[model samples]
Target: TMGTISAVATDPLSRLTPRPLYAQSADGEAFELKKNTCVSVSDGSLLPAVDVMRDELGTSYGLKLAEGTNCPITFTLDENLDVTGHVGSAQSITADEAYTIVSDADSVTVKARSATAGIWAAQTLLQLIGPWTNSTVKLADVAFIPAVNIADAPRYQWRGVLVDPARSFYPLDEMKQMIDVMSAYKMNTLHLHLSEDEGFRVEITNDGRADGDTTDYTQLAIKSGAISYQSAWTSNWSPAQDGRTGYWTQSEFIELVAYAADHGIAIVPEIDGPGHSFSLLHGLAELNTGNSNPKPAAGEDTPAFIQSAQGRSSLATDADITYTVLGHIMDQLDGMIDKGIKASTMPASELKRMYFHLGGDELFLSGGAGNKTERLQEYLGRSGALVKERDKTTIVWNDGLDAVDQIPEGSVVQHWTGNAANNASIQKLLNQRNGKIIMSPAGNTYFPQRPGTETTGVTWACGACTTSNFYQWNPTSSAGTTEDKVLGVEDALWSEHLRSLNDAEFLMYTRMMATAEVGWTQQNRKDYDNWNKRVGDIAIDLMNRGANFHKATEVTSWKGSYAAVDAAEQKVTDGKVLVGRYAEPGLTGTDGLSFTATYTAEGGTAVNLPVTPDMKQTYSQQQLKNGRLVVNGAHMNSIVDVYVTLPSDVLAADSEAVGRLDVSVSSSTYPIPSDSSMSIAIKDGKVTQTWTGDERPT
Candidate 1:
């Protein structure tokens, strides 16, 4: 219902997710876009948005939109526009990201106050393109854009996604693909968790600052043998390859930073420390200024002594050397940005005030000797100082150490652990120190956790969260902080279990898009069912762009055949029957698929009654005879539960309930046999089934 070009062509605004702040469908003829449609822009600031639009049109509609002074599509900057950012200021909100789109019978024009706003407008413009066709040679074009007016801006400033490459590294190309899709959804940040207990993901070139100690120990950072290190880990779902072993060089990282900046995304680099410091300390042991005590042997399950109290206490006890190492890493990050600016690959403003995430979570210092909390504060404080010195803001996870006066003022607190204690502490930090917080409550934002019936990810976060779980939860409410103090909402993919890009995509695509809406759309403007339908179009677009992703059943718009029954034979078969089985080649988990069933019996009224799994459905013979079974929200494979209430009048006894009718099938997709049989019967005047199916039926 959502993907057909006809529906979108008729109403371009219908399927737009992260729905605009304000939109109006005008009563007029739609503007038809031709193959020769040209785009004219007022300044270079709109170039990023324009380039992205051009690339998308080329990919989706096979249109190579050209530029001209006077063209059908025009983008202009108006400083006078009353656009405001989510950041709160006592004065009028001057940081503009608001944009206005006007599509009329002749042409379409977008007006924004800044390039960021123009980027958002360009995304909406792609959605506005309608169905088209080539008459002579046979090619696609933008048929027509429905006449409409839209004024929009994000609901939050820091819409972001965190990807941990340290656990399972993704190549530069894959990261670029993710950034491309992210920009389409108007997400503004990509946080890279670069270091962890498993690996340090970036190259470190010692600059002889330690009195002629020039060493390139990037290999040691990755634990020397990257493939073996990754393959030996039980957490990895996909097998490790040679590509997983390489670290991003300084130039390569700068290239990535520039690429992200070009797409209107800021790259937040995170170097987890103090606790998850095995990789960092393993590679840069020379930075340790403690006694020359040999690292004690450890059990197989336990971390080596290098990442233990010995390693942390060594650095924690010596602030001078620790600051030097921390400063060098910070300088490397800044140096990448500086290079990007020098080459004009990205503007300096892109990262002038970018936030650096100094991970301060999950510190296991049980066997330590010194004051552990004070030591953590020491490391965190020094790291925060280095980040601040580089003209960057500091961000740390809300664990390891409490947010007492130790945390730097104006620093960001990323709330990941959502227990009562952590939530209260974060709120206290915000209230007392006026600290801003990024809400990534594990239950809602952690993507490495399995969702629904997904088999690839773990379940320590929310058991099995659904896309709705990410969208419906309020960020401020989860963090126990006020809206003003909340910087934004972000979803994180800690790649301990992810083996490749496809594995990460399966968990991120649908759920992260939902997070985008959660960050960009206000609570009053959101509706779960509407979003369920809207996301299908976006998912298809992601696929069209060659980005591997999951086809989740929660998206009611995504339809697939469960099983086909032969009317004449009254039997079901396999092979030809398209049923939910294994996912695509790259994916490791099952893609809980669903389908629609139509009953074409004569003399019956078709009614549409949306129902959930286990919910009862009652219908008369006339009504049930010829109707379509709209099945959706299949949470798992093996069984699909659907209820059909036959005409009660058909029963001979005329009783409230009917006798049990067991349906058996060994090779069919639906009514998956349990105990080698499935029963369909009326209980308390409603039809029910005994199976393992969990789908939303209508």
Candidate 2:
């Protein structure tokens, strides 16, 4: 029978619960203990007897006993126990006798005759105590568990999350929130995209700016009455606005790094290289090949890209160009590492292992523009060598794989473009290669596009990928292969339309929640519906904590068009309302009263009102009261206007309505007591009272 026995001790102050700490076989011959223990445990099978004594007893206490002693305490695991101590004579004993003495020893020492027993004892001792504490420890008479056989190892060694701040800058607080979330899920890496075509979100000391600045240009163009546009020369391409510049300072970056470390996440900074280097090119225009040319001028309504252009240039394979541009960026990265290492809260050794992500995706290769692929290949070769030279790891986008025959053996490749359909190709690459690869398929992971819109404006590779879609994704989808065995998975957010940090929050929250479960939980343990419920709850929690989010599946209605016009003076003669008394220039009226009118309606409405030859005749025998005119046995409550013509030399007289008047009276009508009626007068062809009632001015 496989025999094992284990014992566990508990500490009152330890956060770990010590109850039910041991598991035993039915026969009481074998036992297992919690892997994570509160105190240092000694194993006779692995550690020397003296070391074991020192581990259980304080070093000073052991040393004092070791000194001025003729016979010092000596521990051994053999059946014939030979003991040596200052207070006792040397003696030998059988296994049973040895066990008795061991139980009574001042310092606890566990021993087992069989390999199974030894393993059991090691586990028992590990559970018997907490992390090494100088305070006094008490061992309890706890029940022991017996175990027969066991084997254990981690399923996946590396799990990570990549946050793209380049799309939109996230403050240190947000980074901390991400770190907290990642650590809770056991994620080990946080990849940060520091720069992109639109902006430089991070402050690099080498760039000389302490606070990072944004590239928004909305305000500048409004003031200049010029069209706002993005600058091609600099990531700082904000159209001149009220001068609200934004950038993360070096201190902020350091704070984020420390925050990540505290939560067990390693921050890997990524600065786009070769292709997405527009931001860098703009910031350091001298690095551009066409800096000598005059910068392009933008009209008030120019597009962002048009305004920001230094010149149309491409990533070329020129060694001078490569080194001058990318080399300087690398130099800054190196400095950042040094700064990070110095200020890191993690161990100095851990800090030395910082990783750098060299972005190489969507490298547009227009002819005459530098051959970006060739340029990238050259730079990767040099930069990879440099990173490895400094004993650091380099992460590159998967696109770099097609260009170079071989990448540095241990460099990490981020698989962003392809998915399960192309798994075979990826499998072959991983099979033939010696590197780790992170899976981030745009088809399943890009979150910018709202799922179903087929327009190319958004980078949403997969339209409306639902929560279930994210939950069901398996990083190791390439069956019959072990490619996933080497790398992990990440969900990336490219925020072109994400104008605020809130947009980033919306993209990442639910997606990352799904990703966390995928990354940490075993594939067999995963349940899509179970994870979705958790995601819903987490989304609500995020809102309660003050995060602004766009609903995952919601739509809002927007108004389309409106029209308004000024009709201060007008008459309705033929059921048509016309303003201005007579026709002039473009007017069609027959009299000398020239009409001046402006249409404020989006779509013009046809007018069919009769044109009176004389205003006096039109209102003949009419009596005015308040703002209405009683005419033809009827009260025209809303007399908009009246004009009188007396020869071509006589000036026209007009009367207009003021406020609103009751006009319920018909030509042959009487007032019913049930409804009240009032009449207003028109002075000089104008109504004296203001229009009444809620209806539009009639």
Candidate 3:
């Protein structure tokens, strides 16, 4: 057992002299002191308390006394009597002087570099107050005790939050909230994904139009509802009713960057290049000379049609158009850089640093001209040379490494997909190229792929990537024989299906927390069990803040039973009956509807069918009796046609049921029915049925 005691400073001139204080112990020792006797002072060490004050000024403050109150007080200060705490807060603080004040007052005050250090001091004072409050407490205490000797610094320089605006447009409020979340997590990087196939989500100033126009004619035709002779090309159109929109205005983007900078997050804007450039095609269609020619007539039955090939030539391969489009994009990039830096709160010199993410992923080789790798290399070499000329850093996607042999020196490669297969290729580039690389492999670290299925859907449309998966992902795992080649890891989310901010929040919740730990915690200290426990604790806070999460080991469990029966009259006098039963012990459901059944059936079908009542549920059903016949239970009168053939062994003398049957069910996943079965009777080679508790038989 540990013993505890309390001390109070009686100095009348103490800064805490105006505050009252009290302490009580479970052992019945209650200590009460006068305001004048309670000594307190504001110093850099109490900066956390000040932060708390700033965060919760309107709320009442209280202090809880804890055990182990006796601790050493050391005061260290700079020449100017100034103190600082964390990275974002210390710019204004000069070299500090040390001052220590002890008191029975419940609260403390401090002038420090950051709220983090202030928070540390608040914790220290709470400890000194003894075990009345556990490890953490509210900062609104009465007595202000000030400590003087503590130093702190950040270990890693760059902590980031990558937002994919291309997949789903994030409104201004959502972006601000994201910044707030990142600031709270101590992240310093806000990477904005501005372009993708579905849409462009960043406004480019002086480009004549705010929304980046798309150029893929097939897609444009589809959106515009232009009739296309080619079937595949017809699928490119987007319906206006579906709300297809484009990027944020320059002012809006500037405002977002400013907001993020104020919270200490650096805004790195990405403009996809040499790939995912369909929007460019839409916007710059007139620049393409190839489109001026009419599509050639289709050949009637030629296996190798030379003329047909000419008609499908891509506009992207045209050199003049490529340069013009790229030049315009580069100009916009320059504008964004100027605006972002000017809006940043950091010093002008530091603000001059702009990180441009030149996206180079999924450049469909079939749709582009000539060799993709070659084209990418030329584009990047040109763009990077320009970026370097401007003294800015260029970060291109890993696929750009396919053209690694040609990439200009000093560019950064963002490795996303193809981690395993491209290791050797990546190593080759790293060994030779001067550029650094950031590994963001989608297979292992993509947060939107719901826990178990890391790969599914059309590239980006997916669900929550699990905490376990994120925890196991290591950035340096792919360093490949070279140490310096690895820069770090970044978790990515391409939000194609994420229509709302809540969807984005749900996707990032536990996965982002896991990512933070992976990025920050030392390798030796990393423990899955410990992390899991900590995550559970943190999850409570996240839920309070309205984050969506799945807590149980298994979020869903299902069980159900069903039975089927059939009756038929082979002849006018002969009767036949069949029955079956099914038991589904364990089945599961997800964000998408799904289920399984352990079933058996005899004469009629034992169907384990998915009941998609509306657009919400999507699952498949199977009938054991008919292999797998789809049944639309929602509409009973809705009929489907099935062709049935009698075996050649059947004799002509025997009359059999041949056509027209209606089946009824007691209850279905879609609609509840009055009858559970249907009856089939055969008379003179004809079939007739009135359904009850039995299925029709042929």
Candidate 4:
């Protein structure tokens, strides 16, 4: 028999996330841990880590290992060097963030280039040689790990998930669970969406105005989860909704930073503003463009243009940016996450400097060249400048690039809105504008309609986004943007709609696994089916670790297209206006109204491919005259999306490109219920992405 107690045959191969940088395994020998076997580390700083692994094993086997100089398993940390008798050489994993493990019949050794890497190596070892069954980390009858050489590191230095705690305040405990899960996979960044139009979860006194305190300010209760603003804006949403209350105390935040650093995860706190900023309006009141707006009202007939909840209480402004509040908050964090004593301003190049996300997204306060737009630009510019003066980088959404002219140079743009033809144009726009960018497109990584294996989550607009959709997209391919300027990808979880923890957990896991892979693995190594299986495998670990993710093999859908619209011209007819749209490497469509059961457009028209004389949809008045849509009647109750991209031969010049448009309808025909849009670029030909639009531009 191999051994009376050998888990090698029973334990799962530690199905690690983000996979490893490089790994090769063989079957000849296995390292077995004896009852008295001890794992030791030289640095006193590393003793706790040994205990962690020991606890994982002791949990299942009920065996306690001793700590001594000479042990069955050994861990080493040094600048660089290789080891013999080890299935994996030490230098083979010499990258700073890299680790290598070699296990054989005699002893097992893990070599890490750094302490952080050592932690990862130990975690990986537990997975390989330890037993895992259902929800518990156990010790199986077998104790040998297969003869394997393991090497690993992340693909992108930035692998992050954007969590919107402001929208829905999850318990801090739940938040901690998420961080631990990320750490397990060697993930490095945590972008916390702490502010939103709905609420502010971080405590800020704002009275730190002019921000010259030079020291941290105390967190007030009113500044917490909607205490001050709850009555003014969204009365329906508050700490009460989360079944909890109070903003994160500085003490809690301090622990958060320290805990994460211990696990190799960096904290990137986001105080969203200039867009999803209604929350802050309550705290400072000055941040609201329409300070003159009424206290609060109901419905769309509010006089306050700056918005006091009541459906955008109105809008306007220009900026004399104020950092006193944020400065105080930043100083508070800068200290705890490091030391004490906080200051708001610093140099953009300061070593303690950082990249601050100045939200330039979903701004209801501005449109066109009006007071709102101008105010937006001025605020962003002054604010961006202020942050830069403090030695931090400013990052904004790519939505208002026309105003990028206002923001300082070197500020990073976050390109969201995925591969719509217009997205490509925007990428070109940013590329020409000459600035760094981070990709967080809604189509690929946005939060909505996660399409769980069974029940659909939130098909907010564009119906379903499959797991395959998650990793299939690469930053280099983002809307024609080159990898040279793309920083990395971020998975966003924007819970506009209330999401229960379980649903939210399910929402994150498999896709998050896809996220880890996308951020770390090369595009060439992608296999949706293979990735799908890996996600299912790792989900067990996530669940066992106390994460509340959905366990079933989640199903996902994918449709590809590059979108954009440039120099579009439009005209209104009857009660509707035609909105111009764009499509990619090169293509076009110029036509009229068409209808179908599908509300999303998948690909270019397939007139020849499937003129299917099927029996479902009946157009009482329809014809394909001259390869064009001519419909007079016979329609479904809802205006289902009809995927329309003009076929190649449709080009004129001899052969050229013509653009197609979304027929903008009047408010009365507006699905009786909803939808407004800023720009039009539909995915899957049937599903719409959020509601946007200002006017039926004539």
The numbered model that scores best in lDDT is 1
Better of 2 and 3 by TM-score: 3
Best by TM-score: 1
Tell me each candidate's RMSD, in Å, in order. 14.9, 30.1, 22.9, 23.2
Winner on lDDT between 1 and 2 is 1
Ranking by TM-score: 1, 4, 3, 2
Q: Report the error of model 1 at residue 396, Å.
A: 0.6
Model 4: how far residue 541 lies from native, Å: 2.3
For all predicted structures, in order, the TM-scores are: 0.72, 0.49, 0.54, 0.65
Global lDDT of each model?
0.59, 0.40, 0.42, 0.50
Tens digits of per-residue lDDT for model 2 on 1-698? 77542212222112111111112222223221211212222232223222322333332111222311222122234443222221123211112211211221223334433222222233223223222211122111112222221111112434566665654455677667666545534455777766655556655443532233332322221221221113222233121112112555667766776555544455677876655655554454334343211222353222233433323323444445444444445555566655764554344443333566776553454444345556567667776665666576677786666543444666667777655336554455456555566777665556654433321224345556655566677666632345344456777766444444444555555556566556544455566655543333343234323343333432221001001111223342222332221101111222423222221111223222232332321211212344232212211111112122212111123533222111111111111111111222234443233221233323
Candidate 1 — worst ten consecutive residues by lDDT sum? Answer: 616-625
C-alpha-based local distance difference test score of model 2 = 0.40
Judge candidate 4 at residue 334 and give its lDDT.
55
Cα lDDT of model 4 overall? 0.50
Stretches > 4 Å off in candidate 2 = 1-155, 206-245, 290-313, 341-344, 348-354, 362-372, 420-428, 449-460, 478-480, 483-485, 536-540, 548-698
Candidate 1 pairs with clashing backbones: none
Q: What is the overall TM-score of model 2 with all chains considered together?
A: 0.49
